[PDB]
Design a protein around this ligand. Structure first.
Ligand SMILES: CCc1ncc(CNC)s1
Length: 185
């Protein structure tokens, strides 16, 4: 792909984070803590899952960023509406305001309803995410495999400002402690 020139500097919004997440001082890395991280509760925090939003809001244009997923067993990445539900249980789907892919139990899937099997021959260490607001497109690229396409959501009905979306996943296994990292331009 040739989307690299739409690169945007994404930073994480502490105030949206689940209370067990640890966000680095530069706001470019997030990982699961082994306990509550001693923050006050607020209506923005994702309560049920280890999720956090980027600070940036997009309502136009073309945007591209990259995320490092090295050695993780489970994660969700993509974009979501600024107004997605924060509390209680919910599915990641466009009907609920999410445009996401994930890794879970050694398989990759796109967050459609129902979910779609992805075909990845080279497990990615870094994922590229491309958003074209006007076109209604969210695309995912395998940086480890020369930028090969993973998945395109088209005909997207964003219906609001978009925010970068992250889930570090649970760490029940002891094999999923590694962080998500926003990679340099
Ligand atoms: C969603 C908040 C959490 N409660 C317990 C957690 C620890 N499990 C890996 S994370």
């Amino acid at each position: 792909h040739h989307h690299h020139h739409h690169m945007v500097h994404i930073t994480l919004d502490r105030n949206t984070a689940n209370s067990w997440l640890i966000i680095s001082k530069d706001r470019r890395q997030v990982r699961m803590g082994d306990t509550h991280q001693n923050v006050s509760d607020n209506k923005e925090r994702f309560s049920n899952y280890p999720m956090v939003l980027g600070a940036q809001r997009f309502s136009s244009g073309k945007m591209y960023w990259e995320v490092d997923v090295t050695q993780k067993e489970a994660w969700d990445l993509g974009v979501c509406r600024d107004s997605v539900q924060r509390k209680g249980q919910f599915s990641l789907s466009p009907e609920n305001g999410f445009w996401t892919i994930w890794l879970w139990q050694d398989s990759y899937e796109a967050g459609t309803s129902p979910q779609t099997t992805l075909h990845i021959q080279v497990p990615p260490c870094q994922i590229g995410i491309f958003v074209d607001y006007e076109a209604g497109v969210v695309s995912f690229y395998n940086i480890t495999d020369h930028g090969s396409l993973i998945y395109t959501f088209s005909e997207c009905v964003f219906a609001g400002p978009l925010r970068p979306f992250f889930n570090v996943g649970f760490n029940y296994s002891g094999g999923n402690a590694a962080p998500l990292k926003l990679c340099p331009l």
